[PDB]
Scaffold this active site. Structure first.
Site, PDB file in Angstrom:
ATOM      1  N   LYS A  34       4.634   4.203  -0.155  1.00 39.21           N
ATOM      2  CA  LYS A  34       5.731   4.529  -1.045  1.00 39.21           C
ATOM      3  C   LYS A  34       6.749   3.396  -1.046  1.00 39.21           C
ATOM      4  O   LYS A  34       6.907   2.705  -0.037  1.00 39.21           O
ATOM      5  CB  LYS A  34       6.415   5.834  -0.626  1.00 39.21           C
TER       6      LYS A  34
ATOM      7  N   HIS B 247     -10.384   9.200  -5.612  1.00 34.55           N
ATOM      8  CA  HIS B 247      -9.185   9.923  -5.989  1.00 34.55           C
ATOM      9  C   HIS B 247      -9.471  10.742  -7.240  1.00 34.55           C
ATOM     10  O   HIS B 247     -10.226  10.322  -8.116  1.00 34.55           O
ATOM     11  CB  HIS B 247      -8.027   8.954  -6.224  1.00 34.55           C
TER      12      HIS B 247
END
Lengths: 426, 101, 426, 426, 426, 101, 101
Positions: free
Chosen positions: A154, A273
Site C-alpha cells: 500500500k 487474482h
C-alpha cells in the site's frame, strides 16, 4: 424440448460433463419445461436440411434431474449432462462458451445461476492443471508445516518503483513470505513495469540474504497484449523471480492458459487474482458461482487462487474442490457433484481482506496449513503477523483448540515478543 | 545475525517438552520423523544430511529425542531439523529446527 | 469518504475517465456515502508509512455527482472521475481491473451496475481500435449501399468439415455475404479446426467464382492458448480468408487485443462474438451494461460486434457509440456521457437471432446500411433474404416508409421473385 | 488564404497542435496574408476532382492569431492550430515533416522561425517519452541531492581504445559520475568501436569497485545503419553499461525513437547529444528554435539532452519544458504555449562547454540538482570539480546565496582540500 | 590556431576530405584567424595529459586556402582538408557530425555556410551509393529516351485508401509513369498505411495491365521507428511494388542508409524526398547548401532525389554532381571541388513544383532525359502532359530548339491531340 | 580505503551542526527525513535497513539527530544515511551519510 | 451465367425511372454521382474506369442519365456503375449497376 431434452431416467456417464443450474422460470413456464430449455439452449439451441447429415441425439445436452430448492419458491435445480464430444480438449474457453455462452440470455428464465460443473476425468486429463501445485510449491519454496503469509503493498497507486521496492523489502525482511503487486499496478506512468520488476527483484534478493528464507513477490504480468505479457513474464524469469501474478478474469482464460503453460515450462509459480469476480458471482440468483470459476482455474492453471476472506461451508467446499483429489458431493458445502481430479495437483487458496492478527487462530483452523494468508505495514508488523501465525500453528499441533484458546495463545506468545505485544495492544 | 529458519524460528528455541509435543503430534498424524543435519542453513540449499534413517518404527517421542541428542553429540556445531511426510497426501507436512550451533 | 471522495463541485477534466454507476445502498447507508464509497473502492480502496511517500490526492477517484433514479426508490446514479494516470495505455484489461475490479463486492452496496464510461481522447489515442473499421471494411469487401447479410451454419455440432463446407457453399452461392462458425465450434473431435478451415476456404472460393461477389466466413479462431489462436489465424490468412471471428469475453481482452493487432498487420477483418454477455449485462440492477463492453471492444479492436436482436432506444444509443465519431449525452438512449472517438474507426453492429425476413424492413430502418443482418437454410432461402434486403433498401432510397409499406414492398418484390414469394408464403 | 486560413476568432481545441512562427513577410505582402500562407503551406499547400471526395475544412491548419514582434519592424508572430488527425501517432518525424517540411521554402516570407509547438495531451500519450526519466534515473544510479558531473575525454581523436579506457578510469576514479565519448568518435580506424566499448567497460568496473559509487560512460552508438547501431547498443548492454549516447539530429528521429524504445526495453539510459543544432537554431530570424527540438526529443525519447552552456531566460524556459510536467506560457522565458506532459517523465539537461569550476556556484543555482554538469583533466582535477560541486550544494542547502558567496564558499572548501586549492589557484 | 591550423602552402592529398566554407567573421576577427578557427572547431576543437599519448598533427584539419568572396564585403571562402582517418567508413552521419557538428555555433563567426565537400575516392568506395542508379533503373522500368513523368496525389490529406487508389489509377492510366504519396502521408487515422499500400498496389496493377507500360507509385515508408519502416518496406516488396519513398532529412541518414541497403538487397527503387531542406539551405549566408546534402544522399543511397523547380547554374552544377561520374570544379555552377565518383551510380534528379506543361520544353532542355518531371489532375491531364513531353523529346532529337520553338512544338502536337489542345487552351 | 558515498562524502565528515542545517533545509522544503542504516556500502546495493519509521511528524532538527544518535548506539559499526522525499515531485531529493563505522 | 453485382443485382434491371429515383436520393443526401465503367466485373477488381469526371455541379437526375446514355453509346459492351460518396462521413454510400453488356 421436454420430450427430447428432459430425460429423468437418464443416468450420466462417467465421461459426461454435468452442470447444476439454479433457475427461476418466468410465470407460466413450468419448471421441467424450463429445465429442458436450459439443456437445449446450452447444447443445440432449438429444421434445416443439414440436420439430417448429422446425428442429432449424440450431441444433445440432456436434463436428467430437476428438483425444487428447499425453503424457496419458484426456484429449482436443473442437472444437465453433456457428452464429452461437445468440448475442445484442454480449453476452458470452449467449455465456458458451450455451457454459459448463451443460456443466460434465455427469456423464459427469470433468473439463472450455474452452481457447479462436474468435469469428467477424461476431460480433466486434457488440461495441464496448476504449473506446479501445492506439494511442489512447498518443495520449491522450502516452506512446510504452516500457511504462507502475504502482504499487498500500500498504497495501490503513487509509489515509484524504488519506493515500491523499499516497501517490499521492509515487509519481507519483517518475516513475511510474499509481498504482492496490487491488481491495478501494471505499467502506469508513475511506475513503469520494468523498473518495478528490477527494484522488487533487488528487494527480494536483499531480504532473502538477510533472513535466510526464500522470499517472493507476485509480480503482476497482466498486460494489454499477449506479447507484453510474455515480455513481462520473461523478464521476471530473467531476474530469478519465483512467482508471478495474473488476473485471469479480466485478462481472460486464453491468456491464463498460455501463461500457465509458460510457468510450467520455466519453473515459475503462478498466483491468480480474481478481479471482477463479484460481477459474476455475488448475486445468489444470477451468474456463475465462484466454485465453477475455481474449478476452471484449476484446469486452466494456477498455483495460487484468491478465495475470499471467510457462507463458510460453501467456501470450505470450494477450497476442498481446489485442493483435494477427490471431493464427495455435499450440498451443505455447495458441492453438487462428486469431483475427481485424477492426480491433477491442487491449488493453494489465498485468504485476504484485512485478516486481522487476532483472527489468525480462526484462519489457521479454517484453512489449515495449505493456504496463503494475505494481509491487506512495516517490518515489526510483519514480524508480529509471523509470530502469531507460528504460535497458532504450534498450539494447534500441541492439541490446544484454536477457536477457544486463540486469544490465550496470542497473549502467551506476546509476552516474549514485543512486536506481537504491540499488535495485540492495538 | 538475524537469520531465520522456515517454521517456528520466530518462536523461542523449542524446549525438549515442546519438541516432544511436536513429535507426538507427528506420531498421531502418522508422520514418521526424519532427522537431518547441516553445517549451514541457506535458503537455496534444499537438502540436508539425514541422520542414519527415517524412524518408521517409532513408538515414543523420546526415541526421536534420543536420536536428536546423539546427533547433537556428534554434530554439536550443526543445525538439526525434524521432517515429517504424509505419504498418503504425498506432502512434507513438518520441517522445523530443533538445534542450532 | 464523503469528506474526501465526494466532490460535488468538481468539474471533470477532459483527460479524466468518467464512470456512471447505478447503485442501491444497503438500508441505513446514505446515498452520498455510498457514492463516495464507490469512488474510493474503485481508486484507492480506503494508514501506512508508505502513504506519505506518495501524493494521495493525485490518484484519487472523485465522485462528482449523485442523483436519484427517476421513478425508482433506493436507486441512484453516481458519476465518478478518474485521473488519466491511473491507467496503463492501450490496455482494456487494466481499465476494467481498475474500475470494476473490486467495487462490485463492496458490502454496503446492495446492487451496483456500471452504466457508462467516458474514455478521454488522450486515453482513446493509445488504443489501435478496430483493425479496419466500417469504411475500410466496405472498401475491402466492395460492398456499398446496403447492410451485409450473414447466416450461422446449423446444426451447431455434428457436421463434418466437408459437409460444413457444403452448407457454407450453399448459403454463400444463394446470395449471402457471410456465413459463420457457431461459437461452440472450435476444434472438436467430430470436426478438427484445420479441416474445417480448409473446406470452408474451398467453399468460399467456389461461391466467389460463381457469384462474382466477395464472400466470407467468420472462421472461429478462439483457442485454448495464445499459440493455438495464432496458428489458426495464421492458417486463415494463408488460405486468403478475409474475416475471422473471436469470442472476446470468454477468451478475454488480452487475447482479443493481440488478435486485433495481428488482424491490422495482416489485413484480416475481425468479427467479435459476445458469448457470455448475458452473465454480465442482463440484470438491470447488477453487472456491466453491454454499452461499456461495446466501448471497450471498440478500443481493444473489432470490425464487427454482435449487438442483439432489437429497449430499442438504448440499443440505438450503443450502436451510435460503436459507429459514430462523436456521440452526445442522451439519457433516453442510455448515453450518460458525451463520447469522442478522435477519428477512431467505428465498429459494424451485427443484428442476429432469427431476424425473420418479414422483419427486414424494420431492421433496415433501425440499423441503416452500416450493419450486418445475421440469419440464425439453403440457397433459395438465402436468395429470398437477399432479394428482400435489396428491395427494402431500394424502397427506402425511393422515399417510401419501410415501417408502413414494408409488407407492401415485400409483396411487390415477391411478385417477380419465386424464392421471396415462397418465403413470404411461409 | 486569409479568407479560409486566417481565423482570428477561432479558439484552439485542447486536441489541437499549435505552432508559433516568427516571420518577416517580403515587402508588399501584408502580415495577415503571410500568416494565412504559413497556415496553408504547412497543412494543405494551396482545384482537382479528388478534392470533393474529401472534407477540406477538417484537415485545415488555421492561423488564429497574428501579432507584431515588440521592438522590431516587419516581424510578427503567427499562431497556427492543426487538428490532431494530421499526425501519425508516436512519430516525431511525421510531426516535423508536416509542420516544417515545406513552409520554410515559401517565397513570400523573407524569414521564418518556428518558435514553439504545443503538443496536445492526446498526442503526447502516443509517445513513449524518455526511456526512464529524471526520477527513475536517479534511482537507478543511486545519486541524489546534487547535479551529476561529467567529463568529455580529450583529445577527441587519436587515442587508442586502451588509452581511452585509461583516461576514462582516471576521470571516473577522480570522483566524476560520467565520462563520455566525443561525438566524432564512432568506429574510426585508430579506434574500433568494439575495442573501445570493451576497454571502457573495464575502466568503469575498476572505478566503480574502487570508489563504491555507480559509474558510467556514454558509449556512442551512433552508427551508419540501424543494424550497426543495434549491434553497438546490444554490446553495451552485454557489458552491463548503464548509459549510451546518441546524436539525434545527424542520425535522425527515426533511429532515435527506435533506440529509445530499445533503451526502455533493456534498462539502459540514453544520453542525447545535439550535434548540428546550430545549423538549425543559431540564427534568431530563421530555422527552428532549440526548444522545439527539445520537446520533440522528450517525445521521441532521451534521458539526457545537451542544453548549452548558459539568453538565460529562454534556456531556463526550455529546461522547464524538458523537466516539468506543466509549464505555463511565459514570453519572457520563450514559452509561447502552456505545455502539459501528462506525467511523461522529464529529461535531464546537460550543461557543458568548459564550465570552469569557479562558475560552479552559478551553474548549481541556475540548473538546480536535476542536471548534468559536463566538463569539456585527471583524477585530482575531477576531485576538485566534485569537491566544489558538493560544497556548493551544501552551502545552497544551508541557505547561503551561491551568487554572492560562491567565491567565499569555494575558498572555504579549498582550505581542507588540496585538489580544490590547486584548481582555485589556477 | 593560425600558426597550426592555417597551412596556405599545404596541398591536399587525394585521400583528404575537403570542405568549402563561406564565412563572415565577427568585427575585429581577421579572416585567416577565422578560417583557422573553422579548421580547428571541425577537427579537434582547440592541454591535457592524454594529448601526448596521441599524434596531434595527424588528425588535424588544415585550412589550406582562404579567399574573399567576389563582390561582397566581410565574406570569405575557407577551404579545409581533413585526413581520411577522421571518418567512419560508409557513414554519412559520422561525416556530417565531424564537419558540421559543432562549427556552426562558433561565436567568432557571424555567418557560416558549408558550400561543398570533396569526398575522396577512398571514402566513396566505402559507401553503397544508390541502390540501383540511373542506368539500372531505366533498365528495370524499361523506360528510355525521355524523362519520367510523375504526379503527386491531391489533396494531401483526407482521401481514404480506396479513393487514394482511385486517384492513382486515373493518373497512371492517363499516361504518367509515377504517382507519389505526399510527404505528410504516413499512417494517419483517416488512411492507415497498410490499406493505402494495398489499394495503391491494386491501382498500379490495373493501370499496368491496361497501358502495357510499367507503372509505379512512391509508397512513403517514412515511419516513427526502424521496425515500422522495415515493415512498410517489406509489405511494399510483398505487393511487387517497384519503388518506395523516404524523407531522408526528417527520418535521418541512419534510417536512410539502412533503407538503401534493404532496397539494394530486395530490388526496390528508392525515391528520396527532401522535406525540411529549406530549414538548412535557403539562407545564402547560413547553413548547408543543398549540393552537399545531395552528395551525402548519393553516398547514403537513393535512386531519385527531389531537386527543386528551376539560381539555374548552381542547380545544373548539383545535378551534374548527382548524375555524372566526374565533375570538374566550376565556380559559376557552384562546384568548388572536382568530384570523382569512382563508378558509383548516379541519382535521378526530380524536378517538381507545378511544372506547367507550357514549361515542358524548357524543363526537357535543362534536365535532359535523365530526370523525373513531377506534376504538383485526371487521365486527360496526364495524357496531355505525356503528349507534350514526347513531342518535346521528338522535337529535340530532330534538332529543333526547344527554347525558341517550344510553343510552336506544343501547338503542332496539340493540333492532333485533344487533351493537349485543352491543356494549351488553359 | 578510498571508498566514497554519493553525496557530501568528498567533504569532511559532517558535524552535528552541519547535519542539523541539512535537516533544517529538509524541513523547510517539506522533506520528511528517513533514516536508514547498513552494515556495508556497495554501489549496486540500493536498499538499506530503515530506522524504525520515517519521521513525518518532525518539528525539530534535533529529533532527527536523536534518532541518529540512537541508531549509532545500536549500530555503531554501521553506516547511517538520511533520506528525504519530495512526494509532490515524486523524487528522492536527499541522500547523505551521517555516520561511518 | 449466374454472376451477380453487389447492390440491386438481385432485383430486376433498374429502369430509367428507378435509376432516376436512386440518383434523386443520391442528390438529396448530397452524394454527387460518379459514373464508372468496366469491360468485365470481377469481385477482386476494385477499380473501374471513371466516366470523364464526378458530377459535382449536378442539379438534375436527368443529367446523370444523359451521361450514362453517352457512356452506353461509347461502351455498349461494358458495365456501368453509379457511385456516390459521403465526404463528411468519408464513406462510399452508393454503388450499383445501371448497364450490362
Amino acid at each position: 424440448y421436454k420430450l427430447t431434452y428432459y430425460t429423468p431416467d437418464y443416468t450420466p456417464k462417467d465421461t459426461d460433463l454435468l452442470a447444476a443450474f439454479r433457475f427461476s422460470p418466468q410465470p407460466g413456464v413450468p419448471a421441467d419445461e424450463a429445465g429442458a430449455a436450459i439443456a437445449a439452449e446450452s447444447s443445440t439451441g432449438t429444421t434445416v436440411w443439414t440436420d439430417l447429415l448429422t446425428d442429432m441425439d449424440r450431441y444433445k445436452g440432456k436434463c436428467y434431474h430437476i428438483e425444487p430448492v428447499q425453503g424457496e419458491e419458484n426456484s429449482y435445480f436443473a442437472f444437465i449432462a453433456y457428452p464429452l464430444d461437445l468440448f475442445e480438449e484442454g480449453s476452458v474457453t470452449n467449455i465456458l462458451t458451450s455451457i454459459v455462452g448463451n443460456v443466460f440470455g434465455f427469456k423464459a428464465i427469470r433468473s439463472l445461476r450455474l452452481e457447479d460443473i462436474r468435469f469428467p476425468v477424461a476431460l480433466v486429463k486434457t488440461f495441464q492443471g496448476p504449473p506446479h501445485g501445492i506439494q511442489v510449491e512447498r518443495d520449491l519454496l522450502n516452506k512446510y508445516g504452516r500457511p504462507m503469509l502475504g502482504c499487498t503493498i500500500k498504497p495501490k497507486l503513487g509509489l515509484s518503483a524504488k519506493n515500491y521496492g523499499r516497501a517490499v523489502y521492509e515487509c519481507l525482511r519483517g518475516g513475511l513470505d510474499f509481498t504482492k503487486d496490487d491488481e491495478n499496478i501494471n505499467s502506469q506512468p508513475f511506475q513503469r513495469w520494468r523498473d518495478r520488476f528490477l527494484f522488487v527483484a533487488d528487494a527480494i534478493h536483499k531480504s532473502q540474504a538477510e533472513t535466510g528464507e526464500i522470499k517472493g513477490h507476485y509480480l503482476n504480468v497482466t498486460a494489454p497484449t499477449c506479447e507484453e505479457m510474455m515480455k513481462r513474464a520473461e523478464f521476471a524469469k530473467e531476474l530469478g523471480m519465483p512467482i508471478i501474478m495474473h488476473d485471469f478474469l479480466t485478462a481472460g482464460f486464453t491468456a491464463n492458459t498460455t501463461l500457465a503453460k509458460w510457468c510450467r515450462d520455466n519453473g515459475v509459480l503462478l498466483h491468480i487474482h480474481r478481479a471482477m469476480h463479484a460481477v459474476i458471482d455475488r448475486q445468489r440468483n444470477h451468474g456463475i458461482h465462484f466454485r465453477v470459476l475455481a474449478k476452471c482455474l484449476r484446469l486452466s492453471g494456477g498455483d495460487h487462487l484468491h478465495s475470499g476472506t471467510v457462507d463458510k461451508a460453501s467456501t470450505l467446499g470450494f477450497v476442498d474442490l481446489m485442493r483435494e483429489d477427490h471431493i464427495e458431493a455435499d450440498r451443505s458445502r455447495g458441492v453438487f457433484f462428486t469431483q475427481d481430479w485424477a492426480s491433477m495437483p491442487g491449488v493453494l487458496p489465498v485468504a485476504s481482506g484485512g485478516i486481522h492478527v487476532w483472527h489468525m487462530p480462526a484462519l489457521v483452523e479454517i484453512f489449515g496449513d495449505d493456504s496463503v494468508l494475505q494481509f491487506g505495514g512495516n517490518a515489526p508488523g510483519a514480524t508480529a503477523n509471523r509470530v502469531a501465525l507460528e504460535a497458532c500453528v504450534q498450539a494447534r499441533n500441541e492439541g490446544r483448540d484454536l477457536y477457544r484458546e486463540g486469544g490465550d495463545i496470542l497473549r502467551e506468545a506476546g509476552k516474549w515478543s514485543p512486536e506481537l505485544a504491540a499488535a495485540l495492544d492495538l | 545475525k538475524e537469520r531465520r529458519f522456515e517454521t517456528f524460528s520466530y518462536l523461542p528455541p523449542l524446549s525438549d517438552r515442546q519438541i516432544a509435543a511436536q513429535i507426538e503430534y507427528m506420531i498421531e498424524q502418522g508422520f514418521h520423523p526424519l532427522i537431518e543435519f547441516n553445517e549451514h542453513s541457506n535458503p537455496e540449499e534444499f537438502y540436508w544430511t539425514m541422520w542414519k534413517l527415517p524412524l518408521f518404527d517409532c513408538k515414543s517421542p523420546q526415541q526421536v529425542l534420543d536420536e536428536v541428542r546423539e546427533c547433537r553429540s556428534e554434530y554439536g556445531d550443526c543445525y538439526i531439523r525434524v521432517a515429517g511426510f504424509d505419504n498418503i497426501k504425498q506432502c512434507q507436512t513438518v520441517s522445523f529446527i530443533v538445534h542450532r550451533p
